[PDB]
Amino acid sequence: GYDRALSIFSPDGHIFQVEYALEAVKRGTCAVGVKGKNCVVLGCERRSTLKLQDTRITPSKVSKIDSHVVLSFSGLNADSRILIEKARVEAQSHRLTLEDPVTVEYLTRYVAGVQQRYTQSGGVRPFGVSTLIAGFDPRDDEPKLYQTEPSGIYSSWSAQTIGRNSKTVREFLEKNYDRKEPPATVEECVKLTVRSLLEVVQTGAKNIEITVVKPDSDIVALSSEEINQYVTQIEQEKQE
Amino acid sequence: MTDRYSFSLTTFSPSGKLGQIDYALTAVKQGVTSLGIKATNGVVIATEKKSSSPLAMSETLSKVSLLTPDIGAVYSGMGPDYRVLVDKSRKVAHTSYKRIYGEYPPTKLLVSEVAKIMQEATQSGGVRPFGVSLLIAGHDEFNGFSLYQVDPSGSYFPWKATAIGKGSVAAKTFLEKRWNDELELEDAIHIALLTLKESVEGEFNGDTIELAIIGDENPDLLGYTGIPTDKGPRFRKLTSQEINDRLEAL
Amino acid sequence: NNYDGDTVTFSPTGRLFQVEYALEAIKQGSVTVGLRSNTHAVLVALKRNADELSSYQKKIIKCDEHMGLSLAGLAPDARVLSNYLRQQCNYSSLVFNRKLAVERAGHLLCDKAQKNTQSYGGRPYGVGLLIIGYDKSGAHLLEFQPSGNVTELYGTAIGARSQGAKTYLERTLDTFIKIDGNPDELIKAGVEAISQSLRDESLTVDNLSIAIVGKDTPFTIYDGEAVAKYI
Amino acid sequence: TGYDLSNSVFSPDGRNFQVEYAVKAVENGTTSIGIKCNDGVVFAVEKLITSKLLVPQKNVKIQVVDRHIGCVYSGLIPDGRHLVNRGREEAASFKKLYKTPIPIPAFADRLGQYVQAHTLYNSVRPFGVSTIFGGVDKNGAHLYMLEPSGSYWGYKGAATGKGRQSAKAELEKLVDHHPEGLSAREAVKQAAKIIYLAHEDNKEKDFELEISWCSLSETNGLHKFVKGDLLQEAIDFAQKEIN
Amino acid sequence: MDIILGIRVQDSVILASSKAVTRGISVLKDSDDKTRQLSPHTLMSFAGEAGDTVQFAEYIQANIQLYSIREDYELSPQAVSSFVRQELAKSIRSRRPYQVNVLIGGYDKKKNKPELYQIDYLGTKVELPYGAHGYSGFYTFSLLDHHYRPDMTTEEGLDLLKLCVQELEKRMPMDFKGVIVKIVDKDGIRQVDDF
Amino acid sequence: DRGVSTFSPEGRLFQVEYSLEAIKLGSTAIGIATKEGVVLGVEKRATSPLLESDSIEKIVEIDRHIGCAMSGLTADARSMIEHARTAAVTHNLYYDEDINVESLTQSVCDLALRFGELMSRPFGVALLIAGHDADDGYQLFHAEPSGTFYRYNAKAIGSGSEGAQAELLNEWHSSLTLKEAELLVLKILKQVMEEKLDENNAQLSCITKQDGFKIYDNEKTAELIKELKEKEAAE
Amino acid sequence: QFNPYGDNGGTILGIAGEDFAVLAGDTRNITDYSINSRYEPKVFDCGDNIVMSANGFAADGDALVKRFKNSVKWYHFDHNDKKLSINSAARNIQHLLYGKRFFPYYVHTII
Amino acid sequence: GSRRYDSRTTIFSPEGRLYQVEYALESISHAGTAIGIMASDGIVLAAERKVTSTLLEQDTSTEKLYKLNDKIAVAVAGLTADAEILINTARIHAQNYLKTYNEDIPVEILVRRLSDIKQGYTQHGGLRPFGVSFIYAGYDDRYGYQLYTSNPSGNYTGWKAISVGANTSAAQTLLQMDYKDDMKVDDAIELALKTLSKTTDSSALTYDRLEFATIRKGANDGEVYQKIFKPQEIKDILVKTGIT
Amino acid sequence: GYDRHITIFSPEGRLYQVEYAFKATNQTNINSLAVRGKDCTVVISQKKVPDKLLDPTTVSYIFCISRTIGMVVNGPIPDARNAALRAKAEAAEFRYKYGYDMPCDVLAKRMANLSQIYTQRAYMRPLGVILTFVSVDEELGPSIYKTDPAGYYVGYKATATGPKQQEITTNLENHFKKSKIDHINEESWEKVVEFAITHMIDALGTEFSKNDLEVGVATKDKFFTLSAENIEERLVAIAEQ
C-alpha cells in the first residue's frame, strides 16, 4: 500500500498537516453547544449563499450516534461522515459486549483516538474536522459536552463553539455563561445558544439549526417557527 | 525492490488539466493517420503501414488486429502500447464475457472493457497512460454495425466516420464531405482509400496500406462445417492483391 | 551534500554520507575501552549522566555467559543489536549445544548492519560496539562499526577522545597482552588506558563500569562499590 | 541534469551514474588479485595493517563458497560479504537440485544476475565491490572478475582496488612470458610478488599478505588457504624481487 | 431452547416461546426469554444450539439497531427477515454454521399489517399465518389448521395459543416450563405477563 | 523532503530532535523521589475559562504501583499508556508478581523508535514514570521519544523545565520527606506556571509502597497550597 | 498412522520441608518392554534454585525443561538479573504447558 | 527512493484545502453543463454534450445521462471514464441492497456510499481523486422525488434544482429566478432547456448537442418510469418549447 | 525536470528514459548483422577483446536461447545476460506448457511485451539492449526478429545493429535491390556465412582476423555458434576468392 509519512514534525516542533486540518475546521460553518441544568443544546450555523437547497434530504449538521448521544462538527463534511459511521458502530459494539450504552466521555475518547491515529499513520492525512459530542450517560441526569479536534486531544466544556468566527462567539459565551448559574431550563439554554449564534450568523432565517438533548434518550430538533420565535424575541429586547 | 510507486503519476494541475493524458494525446497526434468509415452494411478501418527499413517485412507488422470474429481494431500512437492492449482486449472478451454467456461480447461492451483498462493507467499507482487512440469496428446481432474511438483518458465515442493521428483534421473534413447515410460498404472502402491518399506521402499500394472490413459473414473462413448457426467471422483483412484491384478504378 | 538524503545513494567520490553521519554519532558518545590478554578480555566504560539528579547511562550489556559488549552512541540501537546477538548465541546453544564463536558474532553483526545501508527506507545503526568473549580459541576483542566493518584487536577504544586510550594501548601492547591468569591487573591496565581520555573530570564510583570474561570467569559486570577498588 | 541522484536512471549519455559512483568506492579499496594456472587458480589480497592492535592472521578477507570456490574483493567489505552469502545460497540450491557442485561459469552468472538486479531499481544501491573469484570444476579451472554493473568475464589474471593498474601490468608480463602455463606453486609465489609490488600505491601503511588457492593436483580441487611454510616461502620470494 | 410458535392474527403477531433451559439431566433455568427486540415493531424468537442462538440473535439485533441509527428509519419486517435469511444462508456454508432457527414477527407501519416469518438455520424463509420450529409443529400445525381464522382478534389469538400450549403440555415428552408470550402490533411490543 | 529516518550530519535523528521541540512547548510536569514516596505534579493549563479543568488528565495510573505524568502532544500518550498498562497486567499474568518500574519503562521506550518508512513519526510527548518495586524501591524515570530513559531523583519536563530543573538541583537532598516534596513541587510549579497556581490549574499525585498510586482531590491539594503560601511568608 | 507420542516410563517425587525441598526421580528410561538407559537423569537444576522434572514422554519433557531453562535465562536478561521466585516459575510453566493445549506436552511436571 | 516523484495527492494546503480536489473542481467546470430540476410530479435531467462533431453517432450514444437502477439515474460532469468506474460501483451496490433486504435502495443510501468512496481517495492511498461531479435524480417511497449532487471531495447535498459543470454560477441564478415549489414536470422541462440555452457556450441549442431524461410516476399507478429521450424526442421537445 | 528520470510522458509526448536506453545500446561499440539463406539464418557480430588479461573464449554477445533459437545482443553485457536468461526461461516454459518449441517470432513478441512494460510501469528501468533473434522456424522458415527498449519488434529479410548500422543496412539493401530476392540464394550455410562476413567488410571498410568476429548459425533443428577455427576456415575461403 501507499506508505508515505504525510504527518511529520517540522524543525520548530510543529506537525503542519495537523495544523492545516484545523484551518479547514476554521473555515467550516460555526457550531456551538451550551449545557444547561438538565439539558445540553447543540446549535449550528448553516451557510445561506445556497438557496434551492432541499432541507428534507440534505445531511443535517447534528447526528445521532446512539439514542442518547449526538455529535456535531465543523470542517470537511465528507470527513465527518467517516467519524460518525465509526462512532455509531462503536456505540453498537459497546452495547453488545458491555450490555450498556457508551458514556459520553467514552464515546468522545473513541472518536478522539480515531482522529489521533490518522496523525501518525503512513499514507493518511488527518481529519479536517473538530467535533462537539453531547448527551447523558445511561441512567444519569448530569449533562455532558465534549470537544475533539484533528490532533486527537479532547476535553469537557461548560459551553463551547468551533468553526468560522467561533472566537467571536466564545467571547460572547465567556461573558454570558455563569458557571455558578447554568441555564436552569431548556427554554433559557436554547435562548443563550441562539443569542450567541446571532453574534455571527445573519438573519436567524434558515441559518440556524438547534437540537436539544435531555436525560434518558430524549432528543428533539427544533423547527423553523420554533427557532424563529427565539430570534424574534431576542431582537425586540435588543432595542433598549 | 518492488513498486515503491504506489501513488498516481497522473495528477490534476492547478488549471485542471491532467498533464499525462494531454501528453499521451500529443503522442497520438504524431502517430500515423488511421481512420474508420461506417457503411449501411459494413465498416472499414484503414491505416498506412509506414515501414522501419526496406529490410523489414511489414506483413509481420500488422497494425489492424482481430479482437473477436466480429470486431477489429486499428490505432494511432505508440505501437507497442497497442500490441499489449490487443492482447488484453482479446482476453477480457473471453474472461469477462464469452466464458459467462457462451457468446462474444457486443462491440460497445468490449470497447467499454478496453476503455476501463485505459482509464486505470490514468489513475493507478506508478504507471503512465497508454499512448494510443484506438478505432474499434464491430458487429453484434442486436446493435448492428458500429465504430468507436477510444482515447488515452479512457473516453470513447461512436462515429459514422472519423480519422485519428497525423493528418486527422484534414482527413475528418474530407470525410464530412463524402459521408451519407446510404453508403454501401464498397463505397465506404472507396472513400477510405481516397482519404488515406491525402495523408500518405510515399508509395501508395496494397503493401503500404493495411485495411480490413467488418462485413458479411465469411463461412469459407470458419475452418469447419456442420453447425448451421455458426456462419463465420464478419471481420476480414483485405489481401495485398484485393487492395490493388480497388486502386485501378480509383 | 546532495547525496545524503538516504543510505541508498552513493556520492560522486563513492561515499555513503548517512553511514558517515551514523559514524559521527559514535564520536559524540562517551568513551569506552577494550583490551585482552591470552586468558581474559576486559571492557572499561566511562558512563554519562544528564545532570546531577540523573543516573549514568549503562554502556555494558551481557549477551551470553561467555560473551558481551560495550556501546558508544545511540543506546536503543545497541539494544536492538545486543538483543539480536543474544538470540544468535541462544540459537547456537539450543540447536547445536555449542557456544557461539566470538568471530562469528562479528560476521553476524556485520551482515545485519550492512542490510541497513543498501535499501530505501532504512537508516544505518548509530552505535559502535566493542565485543569481548572467551570461546574455544581463547580471549577475543572485536570492534563493530555501523558501516558493517568489524575487526579483531588486542585492544582499542571508541567514543569521544578515545584516541588517547587508543595510543596508550598501542604503546603498552606487549605489557598487557601477557597479563595471563590475572584479572585485577588487566583491569588496572584498562582503567589506566581510559584515563588517557578524560578531561576536567576523572573516574568516580557511579561513573566507571567494568566488565570481564575469560578462562574461568563468566562475563560479569562491576558497578558502584565493586569498582571503588580501582579508582 | 540530476541524473546521478537515483539508481537505475539513464543519463542522456546512456549511463547509470550510481553504478559508476559505486566503482569509485571500489577503486578506493585495497588491492586483490587472481591468477589462473595449469590446473587451478590463486587468490591473494592486501590487508592494510592500520595499527599494532590488529591481531595478525585474524581478520580473514578471502571467503570460500561451497568446497571448491574462492572469492576475494576490493571496496566496501560488508557488501562483498553480503554477495558471498547470496553466492553460498545459490551454490547450496544448485547442489540440492542437481547433486553436482556448481560449475564456475554457472556460479559466475548467479552472482552476475544478482548484482545486475541491483542496477534495475531506485530502491536499492549498487554493490560497492569488485569481486575476483573462481575454482576448479569438471571442465578445469576458471577465474572471473565481477563489477558493480554486474559485468563479469573470464580471465587469465585479474586485479582490482587501489593497486589495480600496477598489478595488471605485472600480470600481462606473466601472460606473455608463460604462454604455455604457470604452475600452481609458481602462481602462489607470483601472487605474493604482485601484491607486494602493487602495495607501492598504498605504502604509508604496511600490510598483511593473504593467499589461497584451488589446484586439481596441489589441493585436489578444493579451496585451501596458503599458510605456514608455504606462505613464508612466497613472502620471501616477494621480499627478493622488491629489492 | 425447543419450543417456539408464532401466530399472525388480524392486527398483530403473537410469539410464544418456552422458558426452560435444560442441560443434561438438570433444568438450569425456568424463566428464560428466548427473544430479542430488533426494532420497536419487530421481534425475533430463536431456538437451537447452545451459545449459537443468543450469539446470533444479539448479532442480528446490533446490526438492525445500527441500521436504525444510521438511516433514522425503521426497516420493514420483510427487509429484516430478508437480511436475517441471508445471514443464515451465508452461515450454512461457513467453517462452523450457526445452528439457530428463528421466528420473526413484526408490524409493518407502512402497510399496517402484521407479518410472521419462519426461517431455519439453512436460510429457508417462508411467510406464514402461523409457524412453529422443532417438534412443536408436529402437534400445533394440525390444531391451528383447524381452529385458526385470518380475521381473529388478538384476544382470539391468545386463546388459540392457550390451546396449542395445552396440547403441547399433554403430549410433549419434556417439561418446557411454560411460554413467554409477546404481542407485536401497531403500538410496538408488549409482553403478556400471566399465561 | 528526505527520509523520516534520516541522520543529520551532526549524527542525530531529525524527526527525534524536532519531536523534542514539541515537548518543550508542552505544559510543565515535575517529579520528585523520596525514601517515603515519589510525587508527580502537572500544570493543567486550561485554554479558556469555559473548559472544565478536572477533565484535563495529564496524570495517569499504569498499575497500582506505577503512575505517569506527561508533557507535550498529550493525544500521543494514549497509546503509550495503553501499552504500559497491558505490559504491566500481562507481566503479572505470566509471572504472578508486580512488574519492575525499570522494566515497564523499558517496555514503553521500546515503542519509541518504532517509526519510519511501524508508525509514521516519533511521539510528540515525554513521560515521567514513577513507581515502587521491592527490588530497587521508589523510582522516577524520564521517558523520551528518542527511546532513551534516565532515572532521576527529580526532573521537570515541558516549557518550565530548564528553569524548574535548576531549582530542583538546588532543593533536592536524599532525606526529603514526602510532605516536603509535595510542597517543593507546588512551589516550583507556581514559579514557572503562566497563570497564578491554584487547585484547579495544577494537580498532584504520589505513589507509596503502602497505598500505591493516588491522584489527589482538589480539596487535598488546595490545603497543601495554603500550607506553602504560609510557610513562605514566614521567612 | 503415525503416533507422535510414546511412554518412556520412570517415576518422580517431590517433598517440601521447612527450609528445604527434594525432587527425586529414578534414572531408568524405557520403551515397551525394553530398557533404553539405566542412567538417563530426568531431574534438573534450572538455576535460581529451582529443580524441575517433566516425567512421561521424554521428548516432550526434555523440550519443556529446555524451554523453561531458557525462560529463566531471558527473565534475567529482561528484568535486571532478578531472581525467579518459585511461584513465578510455576505460573510461567503453566503458560508453557497451556500454550500447547491442543497438542499437549505428555508429562506430569513437578518443580 | 521514489519519494522524489510523489505529488502527495491527499495533503492539505496551508489554508486547509485539498489541492487535488480544488483542481479537480476547476477541471469539472470546463465540462458540459448538466441540470436537474425537481417538480412535485417528477424530475428532469438535462445535459449539454462536450462540443460534438457532425459525424458523431448521436443515437447509440451516452456521455452524460446514465441509469443506476429502475428508480435512480445520474447526470455526469467531468471525466466520462472516471464516471463509468463509479457508475458500475453504484449499480452493484444497488443490487447488493436489493438482494439483502428485498427492497430497492433508498436514493440517499446509494448517494452516500458513492460519496464515501470519493472521500476515500482524498484522505488515504496517494491516488488522484475522481474528476467527476454527479447529479443524482431518483425516487423512493420514503422521500419521494430527490435530487442530489456530489463532487470530487466526497461531499453531497440535496436540491430542488441544481447545475454542475460549466457556468454553474450563471445557470444557478437563472434557476433561482424562475423556479417555484408547486411547479410541474413540463414546466421544469421548459426551465431546464431555457437555462441551458442561455448559458451554452455554443451559438444555438440543437437536439444533437443534448441528452435528456425524465423520472415521472407518469406510468401506470403509484410506480415510477424512467425516460431517456431519443434524439427525435429531444428535437420535438425543443420545437414544442419554441427554442428552434 | 523529473519527466526525464522515469518512464512518463514529456510534454511533446516522449519518453526520455527509453531514448537514453537506446543510446546505451551502442555503448559497447560493436556491430552485428544477420541474413537468411535458403536453409539457414546467419548472425555475425564483431568481437573486440581489448584487455590481454581477459580469457577471449568467455567474451561473447551471441547466446543459444533454445535448441532452435539464437540471440545476439547489442548493448552492455549485464543487461544482455539478464535478457538472455529470461528468454531461455521463457522458451523452456513455453515448451512445457504447450508441447512444442517456442517460435522465434513469438519469443520476440514475448520479450518485446516485457520490454513495453518497463516503459509504462515506473519502478522498472528499460534494458539498454537490442535483441536480434534468429532461427529456422518449422513453420515460417529462416527467421530474423528484433526487439528494442521501446518494446517494438518486427521481422526482417535481413538486418544490422550497432554504431555503423546504417552503412551495413544500405550495403545490404543494395544487394537485395540487385538480386531481386528476399534472401541469400545459397545451398550451404558455410557460403551464407561467407556472404555475411564479406558484406560486413565492404560496409565497414575493415579486414577481420579469426578473433575479431563471432558467428552463429541457425539451421533446421539446431542453432550453433562457430569456433575461431571454423571462422578461420571461412575467412580463408573468402581470401582465395
Side-chain angles (χ1 to χ4, degrees), chain B residues 186-214:
Chain B
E186 269 297 348
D187 308 321
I189 303 183
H190 184 70
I191 296 167
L193 283 173
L194 276 165
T195 324
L196 209 52
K197 196 183 271 210
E198 301 309 283
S199 51
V200 176
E201 199 145 58
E203 306 290 38
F204 196 74
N205 56 67
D207 300 300
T208 58
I209 301 303
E210 205 159 341
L211 189 156
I213 58 173
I214 305 311

Side-chain angles (χ1 to χ4, degrees), chain B residues 71-87:
Chain B
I71 293 138
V74 79
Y75 81 105
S76 291
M78 310 177 59
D81 280 17
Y82 175 70
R83 205 174 56 255
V84 317
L85 271 164
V86 174
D87 286 320

Side-chain angles (χ1 to χ4, degrees), chain A residues 110-121:
Chain A
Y110 173 73
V111 178
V114 179
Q115 277 176 304
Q116 187 283 142
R117 189 198 318 152
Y118 279 66
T119 75
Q120 54 174 340
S121 292

Side-chain angles (χ1 to χ4, degrees), chain G residues 15-33:
Chain G
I15 302 159
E18 197 179 2
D19 62 333
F20 73 101
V22 283
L23 225 221
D26 69 317
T27 69
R28 162 183 285 181
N29 177 297
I30 67 97
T31 75
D32 301 322
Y33 278 117

